[PDB]
Amino acid sequence: FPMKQGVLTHGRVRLLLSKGHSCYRPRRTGERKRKSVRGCIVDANLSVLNLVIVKKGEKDIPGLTDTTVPRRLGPKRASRIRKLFNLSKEDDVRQYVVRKPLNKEGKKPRTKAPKIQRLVTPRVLQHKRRRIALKKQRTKKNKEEAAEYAKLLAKRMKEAKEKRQEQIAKRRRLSSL
Amino acid sequence: DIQTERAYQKQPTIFQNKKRVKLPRYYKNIGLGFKTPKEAIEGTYIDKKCPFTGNVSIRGRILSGVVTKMKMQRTIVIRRDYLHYIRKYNRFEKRHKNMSVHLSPCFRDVQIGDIVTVGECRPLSKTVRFNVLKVTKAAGTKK
Amino acid sequence: GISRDNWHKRRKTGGKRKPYHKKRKYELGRPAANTKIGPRRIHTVRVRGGNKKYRALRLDVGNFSWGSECCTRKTRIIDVVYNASNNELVRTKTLVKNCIVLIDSTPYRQWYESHYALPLGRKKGAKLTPEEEEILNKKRSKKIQKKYDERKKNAKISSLLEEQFQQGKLLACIASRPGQCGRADGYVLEGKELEFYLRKIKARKG
Amino acid sequence: ARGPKKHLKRVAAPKHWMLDKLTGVFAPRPSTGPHKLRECLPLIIFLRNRLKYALTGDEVKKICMQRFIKIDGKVRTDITYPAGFMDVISIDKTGENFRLIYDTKGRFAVHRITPEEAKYKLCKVRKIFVGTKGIPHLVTHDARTIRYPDPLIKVNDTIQIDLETGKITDFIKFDTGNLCMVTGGANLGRIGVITNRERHPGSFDVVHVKDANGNSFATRLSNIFVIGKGNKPWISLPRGKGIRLTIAEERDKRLAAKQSSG
RNA sequence: AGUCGGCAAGCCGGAUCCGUAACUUCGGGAUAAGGAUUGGCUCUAAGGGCUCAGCCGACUUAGAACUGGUGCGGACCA
RNA sequence: CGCUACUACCGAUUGGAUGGUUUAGUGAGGCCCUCGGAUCGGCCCCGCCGGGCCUGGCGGAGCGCUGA
RNA sequence: UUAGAGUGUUCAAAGCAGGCCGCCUGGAUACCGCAGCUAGGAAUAAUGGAAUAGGACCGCGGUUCUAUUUUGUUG
RNA sequence: UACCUGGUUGAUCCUGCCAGUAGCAUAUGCUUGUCUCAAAGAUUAAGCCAUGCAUGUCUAAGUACGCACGGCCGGUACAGUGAAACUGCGAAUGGCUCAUUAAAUCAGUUAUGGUUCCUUUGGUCGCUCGACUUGGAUAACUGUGGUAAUUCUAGAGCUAAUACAUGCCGACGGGCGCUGACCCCCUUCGCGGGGGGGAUGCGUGCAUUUAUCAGUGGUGACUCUAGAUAACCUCGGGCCGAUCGCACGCGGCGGCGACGACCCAUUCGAACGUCUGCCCUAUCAACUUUCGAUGGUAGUCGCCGUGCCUACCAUGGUGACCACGGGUGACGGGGAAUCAGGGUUCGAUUCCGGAGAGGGAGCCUGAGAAACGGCUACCACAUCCAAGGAAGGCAGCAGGCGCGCAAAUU
């Protein structure tokens, strides 16, 4: 039973674990479950302790201070590349990508490069130029239709009053009959 | 007179605190050719469930009945008499359904035996779902 | 949980219903907010349809309106003085719709003295020291004076209304449901309605 | 239930689809759209059970994903789309235009229209909404909220919109004398002139409709759809012209057609 | 289980709110049986006189909050 | 009246059994509220400095502030 | 579903199809009470009107408020 | 096809039942060649269940550095498939069963002017006055592990977004109202009156909440829709696009989409309500109520109407026209059997509606669930264990046990 951080005991308790807690992985969305997790207080009743070296001492352990394994992958987001190689907001960034040569038996050596995400390309600006053009036609459509309607109810302006021009004109003719 | 409750009751639409130097009662047409009674316009009562001076919309069905009890306040119970037809014995049977209707105080004088015309509206209480629209005085009873 | 259903209670005749289906989700009821006076604390809850209600738990300010003057300013609530429903909601000061509260007069006095520039409040014997409201009293142009002094035609306010401007606390009524909207809005009592609640408030003293 | 329905049994489908009850348990459930589930006609039926273009359910899906069926100027790819009343079904491959209007019976007739008449259709306004900035609106019977309409176009009229532009061109005012196309109920499929209007406050207003042959009938105002000024319509009518000859005459008409051709 | 035998001792006990059987001479049985509550404190409501408002006057009941090591008919009475 | 068989009835036994509905106690669990603050941050603070007050790296502590 | 129209499933129970040297058609109709809605009829059966006339009509005379059309426009 | 015959008597005519007669299912017995249809663990046990399966899902168009395959024209990143994983959506439909339930469910009829609604469809989406693209985690993966055991997971290194946060130029150049410095014109002995402009700052989109003021378009009727003003704007903050793919033609402009959202309609509903309708029972005649029973007022809560709930008042409400109580071998209806005309009986059962997943209860997620092929308890029952623990719900399809007169292929 793993130990959950911040439980303030060394025994074992059961807790409702949800989306976000440790020692639990929900299967359905919004699922909760009880799990018997162990306390955070270290004691003799454990099988394993995970330790992480903070400050390296003067001596060198042949197990951990010896074998260095480089970073598995390089940065993938475009902005993270600029922060790595101290690059400007204007210079090219595409050639500064960390590619890795892959070599194995049966295939000739290729080199794989990850696809840079959140990089400015003309496809983006062509996409950005399109929505602002859509904003243009909407404004165009609104001022056209309202003004077209504006003369159209004004087409009924002198069409609604000119009929009442005949209503009271008989109202005086109805008085003289 | 009025304002006999803990809260200050007033018609929620009209605004009675305009600077000066009587009161403009609110009343609506109810529809379906039902004439708003004179006292619903001149009287000063305040009822939120009155179909003329309150926030209820008359809709659905329009029934009729006869008053039987008035001991309840602002509410009376009418009696609907009808004949249920039974197929086997080709006859009828008197049946009755008494329902509780809200009687807005615009109808001052109405006694046991008068025929009222009620109208459906939204549920006003646990049992009340109708409102008194007009009151036809009982047969004779001119004294 | 607590449900608000019709079938759990007796029929019109008095006969007992027998439940034919267990408690449903759409017949839900929640614990009451019981909002108090203090620093703003609002918890939003998800409701039917993926919308939100704002459970005001503690409120200090509120957008109250002055009817006759057609003015409204976001002032701070002071106390709860009267409640028609339950007498225990003024003891444990709780804001619910249709409650007589006290609000500060300053956001209104400074408006009425900027629109009419008259001695509102300010009991005689002491005068303004910073002299800013004195700037509001004088140095008007002659053209603007004649439109300003004709505001004296309606510069009067009720004796009952100005009296509470002495204390700086106005009696206001809550109009928004704070346990639902998160806001505590309302209007300022005036005329008969103000005179009515004063009769109900003094009668509580005895 | 615990939510909305998603299936439809073969027996509970509306009868005017004319689905035989031996093929499958279910029926094509019309996806939500501009028309109600009852008055609609899923285009899976219009292609498999009306034109015999397809045979199975997979076959219309292959047709629709070819971008071949153009409904009201728009191309849909959903087989269960509810092609309702007066929806122009144009096909570019065969150069054919279909308009869904009712037969003299309750069923939908397969009407073939000329292309230049397929670029417009009639619609029945439902209410005159007023937008958030004094912008007038109307909603047609196929849920087309058209803003800035003509001020005279009231609640129970019809309008002649153009499909590609989506704009109103002309409208027929609702009054006695205009033609009508009863849509719903017992007289579903009758075409006649409107002779009288009966007001009923609160309830539904019933309108008396005289047919071209003089056997006048009545229908509530909700199920009426004017189509033309006077007695000359604006749409090309199918065979029968919406008269509903009595069952005595379907017998003599059919038996006369037997020995006439032989 | 002692003993001829529950002898002696013990339990029960006030009040408020509930609830109360067999049987019966219909009156009873009956405080049947069986439950719950009970302190302190701070309040609210109701119950009157004298000239609508003002001025006097007493006790009592019900309800609420808070609070104590669940203790509250704290002894007495029973 | 007597013999045999069967079916119901009365009947001491404060009979028994199984359901149902409950009064009163105790009351799991969730939910809400009032707190709680494990742990994870960032800012600020200066020292060491490469570029022309802004920046990138090294450490610290008040946790001074703030957030989860 | 029942009744029922059409149709040689080889007949029938079925089914909703099928028919002609691309066309021609079908997939109808009736009943579905009781209650509610709509229009007509006025026998039958209820119920009401005016006999302390607070009766009906016909014109009136005064009282109070009010759409106002009017006072050329400004009160 | 509206039909009767035997049996009381010494014999007769009657009342009258018994027994025949014919359907209809349920079981059962005997028998059985063909062929087309076709019911089938409802009745007793909504009793218990081994095992297996029954809900997953990728397009050119959210994330692709797994060589896991694979193209070479590469250095201008990613040919192009693609497991896995993240994200999105669905899992609330269907299927099963009939225990509960007697104005309840349900049916017809209407209302939602008293409410919510994923999706689809159509509208809206430079109106608002101050960026050529921002931030840091995490999965897959590498490595180290634990426990007898699970669809258990811990620790350490990395690494993406249509995941999670943050946030702008533009439109935007001024307009429109409020403050109004100030200036100008006529008349007046004169203060005075009228006609004006006006710097500067402020507020100025929708949605939200409240208050007030007039009648664009509506209804049978709004406290409707729209309009104006004064403010409010929830940090557990309402939007106003920091996305994606194909063609590409002319400093930058343009097509076709995909996805995404606020809001209004629309569809799909759902949820409450209206009127009328339900079997047997009086050896059930009064019932309900300060433990809400019936109303009033004000609130609380709820998506909204309402004793739904709370407080304060009133003393009501139902019943011989059968209330209330009990029974039901009662899910309701469309229907089925049988009939001359009337009826009688059945309806667990493929369609619609309801209810439920061993019994009750509580709840997360979501537009929608009080979900059970989702969780949390308790009760009952039961599995695995290394004895520390872990795990379960066939009234889904098969199948087994049980139960029975009674019902099929793992």
Curated annotation (Swiss-Prot), chain A:
**What are the (3R)-3-hydroxyarginine sites (modified residues) in this protein?**
77
Q: Please list where the region (Disordered) is annotated.
A: 157-177
Protein location: Cytoplasm; Nucleus, Nucleolus
The main location class comes to: cytoplasm
Modified sites of kind N6-acetyllysine = 151
One GO MF term attached to the UniProt entry? structural constituent of ribosome
- Where are the Phosphoserine modifications? 88, 175-176
Residue ranges, compositional bias (Basic and acidic residues): 157-169
From the UniProt record, give one GO term of the biological process aspect: translation
Q: Which UniProt keywords apply?
A: Acetylation, ADP-ribosylation, Cytoplasm, Hydroxylation, Isopeptide bond, Nucleus, Phosphoprotein, Ribonucleoprotein, Ribosomal protein, Ubl conjugation
| PTM annotation | Ribosomal protein S6 is the major substrate of protein kinases in eukaryote ribosomes. The phosphorylation is stimulated by growth factors, tumor promoting agents, and mitogens. It is dephosphorylated at growth arrest. Phosphorylated at Ser-175 and Ser-176 by RPS6KA1 and RPS6KA3; phosphorylation at these sites facilitates the assembly of the pre-initiation complex.
The record's GO CC annotations read: cytosolic ribosome; nucleolus; ribonucleoprotein complex
The family assignment reads: Belongs to the eukaryotic ribosomal protein eS6 family.
Described function: Component of the 40S small ribosomal subunit. Plays an important role in controlling cell growth and proliferation through the selective translation of particular classes of mRNA. Part of the small subunit (SSU) processome, first precursor of the small eukaryotic ribosomal subunit.
Known partners and oligomeric status: Component of the small ribosomal subunit. Part of the small subunit (SSU) processome, composed of more than 70 proteins and the RNA chaperone small nucleolar RNA (snoRNA) U3.
Protein name in UniProt: Small ribosomal subunit protein eS6
Question: What's the source species for this entry?
Answer: Oryctolagus cuniculus (Rabbit)
State the encoding gene. RPS6
Within the intact protein, the region shown is 61 to 237 of 249
Swiss-Prot record, chain B:
Q: Name one GO biological process term.
A: translation
Show the InterPro entries listed in the entry: NA-bd_OB-fold (IPR012340), Ribosomal_uS17 (IPR000266), Ribosomal_uS17_arc/euk (IPR028333), Ribosomal_uS17_CS (IPR019979), Ribosomal_uS17_N (IPR032440)
**What are this entry's molecular-function GO terms?**
rRNA binding; structural constituent of ribosome
Q: Does the keyword Zinc-finger apply?
A: no
Q: Which residues carry this modification: Citrulline?
A: 20
Localization: Cytoplasm; Nucleus, Nucleolus
PROSITE patterns according to UniProt: RIBOSOMAL_S17
Example of a GO cellular component annotation carried by this entry: nucleolus
Q: Which family does it belong to?
A: Belongs to the universal ribosomal protein uS17 family.
Q: What does this protein do?
A: Component of the small ribosomal subunit. The ribosome is a large ribonucleoprotein complex responsible for the synthesis of proteins in the cell. Part of the small subunit (SSU) processome, first precursor of the small eukaryotic ribosomal subunit. During the assembly of the SSU processome in the nucleolus, many ribosome biogenesis factors, an RNA chaperone and ribosomal proteins associate with the nascent pre-rRNA and work in concert to generate RNA folding, modifications, rearrangements and cleavage as well as targeted degradation of pre-ribosomal RNA by the RNA exosome.
**Protein known as:** Small ribosomal subunit protein uS17
Q: Which organism is it from?
A: Oryctolagus cuniculus (Rabbit)
Source taxonomy: Eukaryota, Metazoa, Chordata, Craniata, Vertebrata
Gene this chain is encoded by: RPS11
Curated annotation (Swiss-Prot), chain C:
| Location relative to the cell | Cytoplasm; Membrane; Nucleus, Nucleolus
Positions where Phosphoserine occurs in the chain: 159
Is Nucleus tagged as a keyword?
Answer: yes
Q: List the CDD domains.
A: Ribosomal_S8e_like
Question: Cross-referenced InterPro entries, in alphabetical order?
Answer: Ribosomal_eS8 (IPR001047), Ribosomal_eS8_CS (IPR018283), Ribosomal_protein_eS8_euk (IPR042563), Ribosomal_Se8/biogenesis_NSA2 (IPR022309)
| Top-level division of the source organism's lineage | Eukaryota
Q: What is its main location?
A: cytoplasm
Q: Which GO terms describe its biological process?
A: translation
Which keywords appear in this protein's UniProt record, sorted alphabetically?
A: Acetylation, Cytoplasm, Isopeptide bond, Lipoprotein, Membrane, Myristate, Nucleus, Phosphoprotein, Ribonucleoprotein, Ribosomal protein, Ubl conjugation
Compositionally biased tracts (Basic residues): 7-25
Give the sites modified to N6-acetyllysine: 36, 127
Query: What Pfam families does the entry give?
Result: Ribosomal_S8e
Q: Name one GO molecular function term.
A: structural constituent of ribosome
Show the segment(s) annotated as Disordered: 1-26
Extract the signal peptide range.
Answer: none
Where is the cross-link described as Glycyl lysine isopeptide (Lys-Gly) (interchain with G-Cter in SUMO2)? 169, 192
Q: Which GO terms describe its cellular component?
A: cytosolic ribosome; membrane; nucleolus; ribonucleoprotein complex
Please give the function described in this protein's UniProt entry.
Component of the small ribosomal subunit. The ribosome is a large ribonucleoprotein complex responsible for the synthesis of proteins in the cell. Part of the small subunit (SSU) processome, first precursor of the small eukaryotic ribosomal subunit. During the assembly of the SSU processome in the nucleolus, many ribosome biogenesis factors, an RNA chaperone and ribosomal proteins associate with the nascent pre-rRNA and work in concert to generate RNA folding, modifications, rearrangements and cleavage as well as targeted degradation of pre-ribosomal RNA by the RNA exosome.
Q: What quaternary arrangement does the UniProt entry report?
A: Component of the small ribosomal subunit. Identified in a IGF2BP1-dependent mRNP granule complex containing untranslated mRNAs. Part of the small subunit (SSU) processome, composed of more than 70 proteins and the RNA chaperone small nucleolar RNA (snoRNA) U3.
Q: Which NCBIfam families match?
A: eS8 (TIGR00307)
Q: What is this protein called?
A: Small ribosomal subunit protein eS8
